[PDB]
Structures are given as structure tokens and as C-alpha cells.
Amino acid sequence: PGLEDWEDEFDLENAVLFEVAWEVANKVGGIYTVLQTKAKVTGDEWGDNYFLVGPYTEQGVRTQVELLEAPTPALKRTLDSMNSKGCKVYFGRWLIEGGPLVVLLDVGASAWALERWKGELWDTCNIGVPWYDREANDAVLFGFLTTWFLGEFLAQSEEKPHVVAHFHEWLAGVGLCLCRARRLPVATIFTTHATLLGRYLCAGAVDFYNNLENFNVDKEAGERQIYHRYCMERAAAHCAHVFTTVSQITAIEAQHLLKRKPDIVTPNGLNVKKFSAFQNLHAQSKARIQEFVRGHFYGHLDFNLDKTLYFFIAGRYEFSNKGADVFLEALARLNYLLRVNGSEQTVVAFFIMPARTNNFNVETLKGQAVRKQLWDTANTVKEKFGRKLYESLLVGSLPDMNKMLDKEDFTMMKRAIFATQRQSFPPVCTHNMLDDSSDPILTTIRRIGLFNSSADRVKVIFHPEFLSSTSPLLPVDYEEFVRGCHLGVFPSYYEPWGYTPAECTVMGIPSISTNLSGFGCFMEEHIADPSAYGIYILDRRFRSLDDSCSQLTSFLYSFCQQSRRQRIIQRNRTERLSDLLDWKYLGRYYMSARHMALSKAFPEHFTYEPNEADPRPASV
Amino acid sequence: PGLEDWEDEFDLENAVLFEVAWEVANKVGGIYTVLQTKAKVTGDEWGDNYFLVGPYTEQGVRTQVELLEAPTPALKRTLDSMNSKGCKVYFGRWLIEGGPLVVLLDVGASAWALERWKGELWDTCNIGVPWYDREANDAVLFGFLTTWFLGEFLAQSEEKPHVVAHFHEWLAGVGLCLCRARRLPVATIFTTHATLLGRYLCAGAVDFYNNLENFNVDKEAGERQIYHRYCMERAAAHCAHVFTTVSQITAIEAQHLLKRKPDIVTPNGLNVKKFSAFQNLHAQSKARIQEFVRGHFYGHLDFNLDKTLYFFIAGRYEFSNKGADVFLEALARLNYLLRVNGSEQTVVAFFIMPARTNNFNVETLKGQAVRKQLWDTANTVKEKFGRKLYESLLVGSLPDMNKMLDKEDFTMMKRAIFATQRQSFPPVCTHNMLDDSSDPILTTIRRIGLFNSSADRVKVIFHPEFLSSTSPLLPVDYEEFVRGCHLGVFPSYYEPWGYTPAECTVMGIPSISTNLSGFGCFMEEHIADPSAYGIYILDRRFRSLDDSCSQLTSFLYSFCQQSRRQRIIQRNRTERLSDLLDWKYLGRYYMSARHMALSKAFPEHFTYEPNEADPRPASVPPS
Amino acid sequence: PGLEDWEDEFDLENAVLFEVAWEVANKVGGIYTVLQTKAKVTGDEWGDNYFLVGPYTEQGVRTQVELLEAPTPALKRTLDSMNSKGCKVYFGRWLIEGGPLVVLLDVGASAWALERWKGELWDTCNIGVPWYDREANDAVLFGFLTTWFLGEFLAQSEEKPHVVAHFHEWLAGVGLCLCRARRLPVATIFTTHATLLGRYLCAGAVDFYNNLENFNVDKEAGERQIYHRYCMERAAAHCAHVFTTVSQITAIEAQHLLKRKPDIVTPNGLNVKKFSAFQNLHAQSKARIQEFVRGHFYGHLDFNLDKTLYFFIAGRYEFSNKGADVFLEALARLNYLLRVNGSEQTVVAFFIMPARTNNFNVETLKGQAVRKQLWDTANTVKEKFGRKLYESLLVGSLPDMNKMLDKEDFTMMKRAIFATQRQSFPPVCTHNMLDDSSDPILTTIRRIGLFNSSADRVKVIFHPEFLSSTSPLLPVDYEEFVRGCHLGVFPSYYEPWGYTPAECTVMGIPSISTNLSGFGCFMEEHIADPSAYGIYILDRRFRSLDDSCSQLTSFLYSFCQQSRRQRIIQRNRTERLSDLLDWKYLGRYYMSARHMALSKAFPEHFTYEPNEADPRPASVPPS
């Protein structure tokens, strides 16, 4: 279909791309996966003129970096000069699927220059850094080292090429600022994955999205003691040839806080081939989830398990940002609706959000052991009965059904039956809270009245620990457990890009997102009638909290009212949607941004035609 | 072969057997398994005249007891009378493989009688019980209740049968004492599974087995504040028609401390059919143990794993009683011998003894993760290479071997090789000690110098936690792990009967025991040349500590010097040895003891012929 | 969705249904499966008032009939009377999923009445039967026996119920004719599964469907010496309260040859639950078909197997009726188109049509053996390489790729490469023809030029024998092999109802049918834009032969030009189509027909509202 070599045929000639980022070969957050996945297509486009510049860490170097020798004489001269001038620079390959060249700069070996460099910055942009930050100073050192490397690389080159530099956060924006200060012949791009003030303002300050025009960013930046970081990010965004954000909602947020509209929006992608390695995996995972809920709810298995539906929400334990409270309120409302209308449906909701626990509680392990004992006893009696049936049927006689069971069988089954006696109700949490009084999820569960009662049509299971294949009572990793659920609910409030909903959608699982997140906006823009494809977009930007809860309840109830055929058709449509999130399609925006930067910095040699052409027409 | 109905054809007629024990339907220790396993053959012999009398516990009743109603009018009358006289008695069926009838007595519902009953005992045997014991008072209540039940059962019977009562410890000996006091028409048997003073004297007092004739049992019993318990046990043993012990060494110990030679010795048995459900299982378990030691010793896999031998010792964390110190010293000596003689053998020893830990350490999990990563990478590259080879071979061309590996393969293998880098040596313990300074095993390991060095020919792994199938890094239970080891070393010092060595032998694993344990004495008595069958008996009774360590080192070195064929033949001989430990053969001694009791109590109706008749020696004789 | 209890709420009261057919408990053809599958829903609707009347055969009775006694006194009286009057009648259960009551009549025990009954028929309808038919006489005896049974059942009934009789062919039409002759109080239905003259006229006579109005059925019936059978069928159809056919094309054919338009059309259905037990099964079956074509085409595997498509046609070896010649011509045209346009696609077509063979030929077995040898050698070398890689990677060293292969590996691979040498081209037939000169499929293959050449983009494999799981070289049954194919081509010319295309569609496989068959007409009527759902209907009724071949070539080329995503979407739409062919929906037409018969025969007690309501508009293919 639409591949990289579609219409962007550009005269790259002698051009060098430097992918500057603080998080290459050094796992910290989420852009690490972005760069690691994008390296393959970037190297396919640029060949060997692609370098990733990052800080030097011992752990990362010994784990995933293979040190080599500089392949070009100019690079070797640059490395030798910088190493002899009082620095420490390493070169190698990043042991990832693309195998790109990596330049690693040790910021701990250049403290002596800090007192000088900190002055020079002030003599250039009137930006000062407090001595006690301990994280911005690393950014200053990294930026000065990157500018030094770029200048030396341009000086040592026999024929000077057109250099394109791409900085990825405020941690790397000082290098861009200094590149523009020294008037180096480079083309600068700046990408923001989340505006700095956004996460500060979402928590504490009220109505962040309804006061984007009433925010005096100087005041909030200064009062929170992050004024220098805000100035760094805004200066980096201001003096860049091309400015970019990873989502539309981030584009509005940056246009109102960084005072610059992005020239282009480049969404985050991923490699879908590895995820694709969908009904066989779904069936197996659903069977295992059925076994787990059989074990957990032992002694209370009075509801049909062929009419039960498995919802889930996953991610970091952010109660408001991940929208767990809205999910809980909607679950209570859906429980009331299911009880009132006299339905046979049951809904088991899972909350996989890490918290501060110690171990499992006794009830959960007890239930798993009870289920294992019953399964073993049933298999033993079944095998014995099958052998007896075969033997009695080989002689041409109908089995006397009142003698296939004997004394030890009845003993085993009586012990098994005695095992499943319980007077209490299943717990809503599978672990032991260290802060059970101050936990918000459990507090809301208690407030709204979901105690896994027999009359309740909605059961809730809160599983703090991450899902691991070696766990005693969920011996399965995250992906295979998710493949067996029916729906994923991510009603995010503050979310520049949703990695978890995108991963869920790639696996072929219907999902609920919002228009306050990057993934939700992307899917809303690229699909007509997304609900037919299994994506439910919750209008959370133009609605109140109660209206959002009501709409979520409507979505959940309408999902519960589908037939099995409708659910199958919806899940097939969701499955045929993964190619929209691959770097084979989402990597074209990066190409367009680089072309814009090249044409802006060197208009004599390059010219750009603003082709912004880049899908799912169905129903509506 | 030799079954129950071999020569003991006895006129059982109207006889009732009561198997009195404190530990029926109530799991506490090890005789629970003895009674649970023996119930099947006992019920086959006695039919429905077999009752197990024990205390009433809520947990046991709700877990494994099915309450029923009395099947005979006499039993119903007895139960109703006792329940209306101020007691609480339950009747039921024990949910085990035999399914025997159980009479459960609630000792907490008869505290009001204690002040009376405690007096009556003194008016009968001059035995007092201090009020602060809290465990002997339960024994007194249980004994009085059992005597009450037996008396009422005899009173309510229309035709009086011959009752045989079998008491199993000092906790149940008060009932026997009171049965003999009231001159009831019953035949009493007393079985001791361990003499009370033995475990007290083994720890603290020196040379327990070399001073059995120099012990003034009254003094040691009194000084340890267990004089009343000692008097209870000795009185129960004294006034019994038949006295029994579970082993020969226990027989000498009881003859010298209880002042009565046992009339018979009844060893403990087990059901071998369940254990038999052993070369395929051994191969699979050995492969998994190889994988575990590959993971643990990552970055130091410089020794041949086809020449490595897996020893182990298991049981409760008793450093001296289980003989771990002798094992450690012998391991150090064997390490010196293996290094000096320039051998290619390696010995990995396992110490599975529970201790007080919290979690695994980082190194062990790191090694398991490294092994998993290497296995996954190798399988990925292998599958890719196999697909490419098949494709290139279907077109009739030899594979160009320099192009089957491409960039992402080399990336995966380089990452794995980077992962397998380590500068330190593997740990000797897989957990985090809470008392690492005061641990005796680790202290001795440090003292003798076994740090899993590269030059060391003996590696040591101490795994405190019990082996469980759900463990993160040993996902295997005890039986299936043990089935893959080469030898089990149990040089026990004080051990009335060895359940772990017997279980190991039933599975077909060669083992080392001593003549200071019941299992070792049994195997020494029943086998000629036990070492040919894979049982090495250590002479620990007539030797010093250093001589025992030297003999153990000799045994280990001689085992290490066998060829593979010799080891296979030895393990095959060990496999044909499980039927010696089954209740189908070991249940005949109980029958003989019951016959002796019946003939002693009622000589008019029964007479006993002292037939103490009860195949091994060698196979193919080389010399 | 639409179940049986939807809108036909009818007052059955006391009514008895008799499902008369010559083929109950006696497997002959295809209506056996129809009755066996329909019995479940029919019994659910009618309970125990449902009887199947059929001939008595020893094999069927001993295999699938369980003899019982009459459950009602009237039935017992009827059976006793008929058995004492000179007949032989059996009663029992049919051992099928519904378990319906079966009445079996022995036509061989009533030859004495033939000379009488044959006369009586002439005294009623002026129909004579030649003595040498030997199949119509059985029909006459069966019809007279069925009428006798119905009359006796009505005579012996204490309260007379409303009896509904359903006859299913000309073999059972004499009973209906005699029921109407004797004016019995019964409601008759007649179902025709194929008109008798149709199969005679399709072969030999030209342009059968373009001369339906120019056929003097008396002349063709008389000239073919089947005049008596034709008169039997036409008389049965004429004097029936309700007349039915199994398809629309059969409805026109009967309206023009039997001179009576059907009152209703009842299509054949099946139980889809058993077939459903679709991508995992498809993937596995496609892998096995890939392995088979790898074995067959050894030494010529120069084409991409990830771009090959598997077509097939199955059924009885009727060259013209099953439309094999059109398929072959379209295959040749598609081969020319694929070669001219320089495509990378390959098409392997399968012809599974039984013929008269002896055994496999040498080349096919040779290829299977070669493939097995290559697979074994590759697996051996792969396992050895994986073990060496793991061992060399556990020590932290990159594998020296030039030493992972040694002498015996190269020996095995050289032997395999020598084994894969061939100079000739793969055969088009997997067996040894006994009539290779007179075979039409091979003659047409030779004429059109499909010799499995290297340049040919269409390979052809003709496999006469039925697919069996125990075959040496296709060890798989029909269903699993079909599940792996991409398309099924059934361009039938004469086909009253297509069991094979319907079975293929139930499994979820896109198919090509025609409007000259019952299944094709049904799917055309019930679906809007069937090609979006994977059903390609070929206009063969209003087109010539060459136009049909051109349209089939267009269909095949358009299928070959789809992307993988389009093929996946089409196959999903085909999968969501099986519920249209189930008896849960197709059983309602039988209910409507029975209601019409009851209302026509007994208008006083029953009345029928002519409700003929019984739909797949495309999902989202933007139009």
C-alpha cells in the first residue's frame, strides 16, 4: 500500500542526520521505545549518514552498545580532537533491530567547563540555571557537548555536507539554541513529546483545558520553581527551523503555552509485525481468564460464565490522569442498569495498576489451590471412568452407570466438595495494601458499593503487581492476558499519547479512549464512525465530569447489549486496523519535517512542496 | 509373593480393634501418615470392627471427616449416654483411602471433670500433673475419655466381644494405664515411635549412645522438668500386654530407658503404588537440574556437565541430628581428593533444609534470567537456520554456510553474550539469610573453604525453602527433583525411623544411611551386601566422629569412581527394593503383635505360636 | 434470531405425522442425509407423533435400528393385525441424533399379493408395471403396504386423529395415489428431489434448458422405456394436497415436465454445529497442502509458494453435469492471461473425482519419499546446529560459523541433494488410469496443453480416489483438505441441489456456483451482491458455452488479482454465512407445507394464513 517511497523523492545527496536525544542507549521513559522502533526506517531512508547522539552510561554501554572505530576520517579526527581537549566521547552500534551508529558523550567528565559554559549561555540568551537542580546542569553540559561535536564535525569535513539535527526534548534543546547562536550551517528540528507545564497544571490547578487562554505561563512557571526549565524549553521551541509535537491535543497545548503553533504533527508509531507474531489466541487467553475467575470466586459460582464479559484498564497508577474514577462510577451505574433490567450478563472488571504492596492475601491463594484440587480430582475420576467405559464397551455391553464410581472416587470427590466451603465474599484486591486506608481505588469501590456480592452484576478485581509469566497465580505476561479480554477502557484526561490504548488496539482488542488524548484524536481524525471499528471516543473535552460518566455508562451498556455475532464482526473490524499505527505509514511525517527543515535552512539547494495529503470509510 | 494371608490364620471371631492415637484426623507430625497408610490393610484384615479413637478438632472435621450415625445399637447407646452425661463425642468416617470409622472426643468440653480425674489418677498410680503443662492435661482428659468410652461400649454390648486396644504414644498411654487399673476385659498394646528422653539427651548431653547403661533416667527426667511425662510413658509401657517399638535402635534405647525390652519391633511402612505412579523420569529430572545449574553458574561454565554428579541431603534443619556437619567435612575431603588426582568429575551438592529467610537474592534470579535469554535466542536462531536450510536444500544446493546468519541474528547473539558477563563467583545460598552470622551450614562452608571457585571440584548449593512446583526458580516439587539426583546422603545420628531415606529408596535412588537410624538398621538386617543394592550403611555407632567422616569420604569417592555401566546396574538393583518397605509386608508384624495381645489377655479362647520367621543376597556373583 | 417458534403457532391438537420415504434406515443416495438431519427439528415440533415409514433391510436393522414394542395400543393392534394377515412389519428407534420412531415394512414377504395388487392399481388409475423392472414392483409393494398400514392405524384408533403423510419420491408416490383413491382421512404432501426425465434429457438430448417448453414429455418418457415410472411420478404429483420441490430451478423443471407448479419450495438444509465443531484450521491445512505440493513438484520448485493459490472441484465423476470441461477451459485461459501479464502468482488446481484406478504411480510416491528424506535431514542438521550454538553461546563466544557443520552432516545433505534430481515433469494424475485413452479429463488436459511445465502458471493435479485419512500420500480426510483451499469451483449444469458447494460454503470457503443449480439460485435469491460474500454465481442459463467459459475466466482472474487483505475480508464475510443453510431456518418451509396440507384436507378444524415472508446487504464495502 502506502510505503516510504511513495511521493517524497528528495535530493538527499551529501546530507547527515543527527538524532540528538537524552534517552538513546539509556532507558528512562517512553521515547526510548520510539527511537528504538524508528531507527529501522530512519536507517533505511538515510543509510550510514544517521547518528544518534546521547549521554554515556556504563550500564547501557555494557548491555546494548558495541564500541567500534570511527568509519570516516572526519569522525575519527573529531573524536580524537574532543578526547584530547578534555572530554570523553565513545562511538559504536546500538544493538537494536536497525543497528544505527551511536555517539555517546560523558557529561561527568566535563564538570570543569560547567562554570565557564554556564556563563557563556548567559552571554548568549540571558538564561541562568540554579546550582541545586542537578538535572538541568546535565542538560547544559549535554547541549554544549553536542554543539561542540557538530562544530568539530563540520570543521574536520573535507567537503562540507548539509547537516540536519533533530532534538527531542527540553533536555536536548540547549544544543539547538547554541547551534542557532553560533550560526552553524545546520537545519534544526525540535520535537516535544509533552509540554513541561501541562503535567504540573493538570494536577492541583483546576480546569486545565478550559483555561488554556487564561494561563499566564510566566507566573505558573516561576511559582513552581521550574522557571529555568520552562525558559529552556520555550527558547528551544522558538529558535528552531521546524517545530513538531506528537499529537493534536499537544499541538493546541504547545500553541497556547509555548506560543508557537507546530509546523507539523508527527504521531508515535510502533512495529506491528512483532505484535502480530486473532481468535485462537483470544480463545486460549479467555479460557485461562475463566479458570482464574473460577478459582477466585470459589464457593460463589452461581452466575453463567458463558455470558460474562471481561473489561480492563491498565497503566501507571494515576487515578485522575488515567481516568479510573470515571471508570468506577460508570461501572456502578452499569451495575445498577444490569440489575434493574433483569439481565443474565455479568461483567468482571480488572484494574492492573501498580501500587505499593508486599504479598498476596490468603483468600486468593486459597481459591487458586481449591480450583487446582477440583481440576485434578475431576481429571482423575474422568480418566478412570473413561478406561472403565472403554473396557465395558469392548465386550459389547452398555455401562452399568451405578457401578462406574467406587469408594476412593467418592472419597476424593467428598474431600473436594468439603474444600469449597466459604462464608465470606471474594476480595476486590488480590494483594495486601500497605496503605489500604489511603488507597483511592479501594476508597471509591467502598463508597460506590461493589463488594463482589451475589446480587452484584459487576465484579471488580484490583491486581497491583505487574503481570508476569512467573507469578504464582497469574502465570501469564501482559500481552497474552490482554488478548483474552473483551474491551479496554482508557478514559484518559491528560495523556499526550496513549501507548497502552495503542498497544491494545494493535492486538485487535476494542477500546475506549477520549478526545483529550493523542491516540484518541488520531483515531477520530483517521476513521469515519470509529465505533463501528471498535474504537469508542469519549467526548471529555466539551463535557463535564458527570456527562462524561453518563456517556461512558452508555458506551458500556451498548457494548453489553450486542449479540455474539455483532461482537465478532466488531472485533474483526478492529483487527483490520493495525497498519494505521505502523512506522511504515507514521514515518512519513518525520520525512516531511526533515524536508521542511532542509528547505528552510538551505533554500538554495533544496525546495519543499507542502504536500500534506497524509482512509477508513464505513457506515456513517 | 508374601501377602497378608500367608500363615497367620487366626480365629478373630467377635473381636473389636480400637486404634487409639492422639493424631487421627489431626495432622501434627509423622505418625499421622503411618496411621493413614496403615488403615487400608488394617480394615482389610478386620472389616468393620476397626475404630480409630482421637481428639476432636474443628479444622480436621470440616476438612477430612464425614459425620455419620452409629452403625450398631451398642455404639449408638454409648454415644448417647456419653453425650448426655456431660461430654461431646462425634462419630464419622475418615476420608482416606481405607475409609475407617472414627470416634472423636472433645477434650475441651470436659474441663469440669479434670479436677476430679486428676485426683483419681493419683488414687490409682501416684502420678501428678503440674497445672502449667497445658499438653499433659489434654493427655489425661483424652485417656479418661477413652477409658470411659471403652467401658461404656463393653457395658452396652448384648454379647461381649474381645476388645483389642492399641495406644501409640505417651499422649495416649493414660487410657491404657486406666484400662489395666479398672481390670476391663481388653487386650492392650503400646507402641513407642520415639522415647521421650532420647531427643532431650542427644542435644546437650554428650555421648548418648555410649552411655546408655550409665544414665540414671530418674535424674535426667526430673532435672528437665518433664518428670510427669516420663512417668506417664514408663507407666504406659510397663502395664501393657504387648510392648512395641518402630525400630531396633529404638528397641535398645527403650530397653535401657523404659526398662522393658519390646516384645516385637514393628517398622513403619508406606504405600509404594502411589510412588510408582524410573529411567525416563530420571532423565527428564536430570535435564532440568542441568538447566538449573547452567543458570546458576552462568559465566563460569568451564566444567563438563556430562561428568557432573548430583548429591543431596533433605529433611528438617537439625544440623547434628541429620548429620549435615559430617556431610560437609566429607565433601571438603572429597574435593581435596578429586583435585589432587586430576579428575574430570564434578560434584554439585544440594542442601534442602528449611531456614528463616525472606526472598531470593539478586544473583540467582539474574542467572535464571540469563539462561532463559540464551535459550530463547538460541531457539530463535536455530529455527531461522532450519527454515533457511530446508529452503536451500529443496532446490538441490548445498547451504552457503557464510550467509545463513544475518544482521538481527548477530544482534541477538551479541546482546546475549553481553548478558553472560560476570566477575564474581556463584553464591552457595539461593536466598537471603536473616541470621547469616549464626547459620551453622554457612559457617562450616566458610570454615572448610567451599566458595564455588573455578578450581573447586565440589560445588555447594543451599536452598532453604521447601521445593514447590510454583517457585519462580525451581518450578518442581520435591519428588520429581529427587528422582533426578544421583545419590542421597543422610548420615543421621538420632533418628528413630528415617522417612526421607525410605522415601528416597522407594523412588529408586541410591542412598547413604547409618546404623544409628531405624531405616539403616532395617536395611542392614534385611539385605546381604547392601552396597551392591545402592544402600551404604555408615558405621556411626562403633566409631568416632573423625572415623565416620573418613568412612563417608571413602563411600563418596568409591561412588565417584564407578563407571556409567556400574552406576546403571547399581540403580537397577536399588529399583527392585521397594516391596521391602510396603505395608503388604510390614503389616504382618502388627498382626503378630495383636495376636500376642489377644493370646495374653484371653488365653482360654486364643493361643499364639511364636512364629518369628518374618531373598536379597547379591544377583550375579562376581566374587 | 429466527427460530422455529417465531410466527407459526398452529393448533396441532391430536395430529400424527408419517414421513414416508424409501430411504430411511437404508443408505442409498442423498436424501438419507436430508431425513437424518431433519429428524431432530421435526421431532422437536411434533414430539412422539412422528413416524418414519420405510423398507426393511437386514443390514440397516442390525446397524442402526433398535427394535422395540409399540408404545400405543392402536399401533400394537395394527402391527399384530398386519403381521397375522400375511405381512412382516417391524418397529423401533432410528439410532440418529433425533431418535425417531421407525416402521419398517418387508416388501419381500408380500410377493404373493403382487399379482393381486398390480391388478387393483389398474382398476384404479390405469397404470401398469412391466414384470422385468424389478425396482418399480418394490415401489408398488411399498405403496400398498403403506396404505394398508395407514388404513389399519386409522381403523384401530379409539379417537381418530388428523394424519399427515409426506411422500418423498416416485418410489413412494403409489402410497399417496392409493391414499387419495380410497378417500382416507389423510393430508398428503409430495416432495420431488429431482424430476425423473431431467437427468435422462440432460445427457444425449441437446439444449435441455432452452427447450423446456418444446418437450413432449409423453414421447421422451415412452421412447426411453420408463413410461410407467414417469406415469407413477406424475400421478403422485397430480393427486397431492401439497406439492413441493427442493429448489427453484427444479420448480420450473417440474412445472414444465410434471405440469404442476409447486405450492412451495423447501430447500435442503444441514446441521452446521457439527461442521463448526476459521483461520487456524485454514493455516494448518494450507501448510499440509504446501508440503504435498513440495513433495509432488520436487526438482521443479522454481516458483514462489507464498504466492500460490489452491483451487479445487469435487463430486461425482460427471464431466458435463459437474462442469469440469468449463473449469478446464477457464484454467487454460487464466494460464494464458497469467503468463502474458508477467505475474508472480501460481495456481494449483485439484480435481478430486473418483475414477476406475488400481494404485498410485511411481513418481508420486517417489516425490513424497524425497520430501520426507529432505525434511528429516534438515531437522537432524538443525537440531545438531542448535545444540552446538547453545553450547558455544553459554561460554560467551560468537559461533564460528565455518565449523558448525562436519563430515556426516555434509554426507546427509549430499545424499539428499542427489535424491532431489529429476529430468521429467510432474504428472497431472496421481494414480494409474485403467482407461487413460478414454478419460475425458486427461484428454482435455492434453488438448489444452497443461503438462505442469516450468513456464506454466497453472498446475493441475487429478486425484481420483476419495480423500481418506489413511491414504499413504494424502493422510487427511476431505473436510480438512478442503479447509485449506482458497476457492471451490462448481460450475454445475444439471444439479437440483448442490451438496458439495453447500458443504464448502458452510466451512467458510469462497465458492463459484451457477444459476442452473439449486444452491446457486438459493444464494442468489437470499444475498444482495453475493460476490462480496465470496459466492460467485455464473450466468449459465442465459449464456452459451463460450460465454460461460469467458465469464468463469473473468471470475478466476478477478479472484487472483485481489490483495491479501481483500481475500481475508471476503473469507470473513463468507464465514458469517453458515446460518442461512441450517435446518433451524430451512425447517420452517416444511412447517408451512404441513400447515397447508392440514388446512386443505381438513378445512373445518384448521385454517392457514398465506404468510410467505420466509436479507444480507453488504457490510461496509463502500459503493
Author numbering:
A (entry chain A): 13 to 289, 293 to 629, 637 to 642
B (entry chain B), C (entry chain C): 13 to 289, 293 to 629, 637 to 645
Verbatim from the authors:
Glycogen synthase (GYS1) is the central enzyme in muscle glycogen biosynthesis. GYS1 activity is inhibited by phosphorylation of its amino (N) and carboxyl (C) termini, which is relieved by allosteric activation of glucose-6-phosphate (Glc6P). We present cryo-EM structures at 3.0–4.0 Å resolution of phosphorylated human GYS1, in complex with a minimal interacting region of glycogenin, in the inhibited, activated and catalytically competent states. Each GYS1 monomer consisted of two Rossmann domains and a tetramerization domain and interacted with GYG1 in a 1:1 ratio.
We determined a 3.0 Å structure of a phosphorylated GYS1–GYG1ΔCD complex with D2 symmetry applied. The cryo-EM map ranged from 2.9 Å resolution at the core to 3.9 Å resolution at the periphery of the complex, allowing for modelling of residues 13–289, 293–629 and 637–645 of GYS1 and residues 317–349 of GYG1. The complex adopted a rectangular box shape, with residues 317–349 of GYG1 at each corner of the GYS1 homotetramer. In this structure, each GYS1 active site, at the cleft between the two Rossmann domains, was in a closed conformation owing to additional intersubunit contacts at a minor interface (B–D or A–C). The as-purified GYS1 was highly phosphorylated, representative of the T state and supported by the lack of GT activity without Glc6P. In the T state, the N and C termini from each subunit traversed from and toward the two regulatory α24 helices at the dimeric (C–D and A–B) interfaces, respectively. Although there was no clear density for phosphorylation sites 2 (Ser8) and 2a (Ser11), they would be positioned near the regulatory α24 helix of the subunit across the dimeric interface, close to both Arg579 and Arg580, which could potentially sense the phosphorylation at these sites. In both the C1 and D2 symmetry maps, strong density was apparent between Arg588 and Arg591 of both GYS1 subunits at the dimeric interface. We modelled a single phosphorylated site 3a (Ser641), which was the first C-terminal phosphorylation site in the sequence. Overall, our model suggests that the nonsymmetric interactions of a single phosphorylated site (3a) at the dimeric (C–D and A–B) interfaces, combined with intersubunit interactions of phosphorylated sites 2 and 2a across the interface, stabilize GYS1 in the inhibited state.
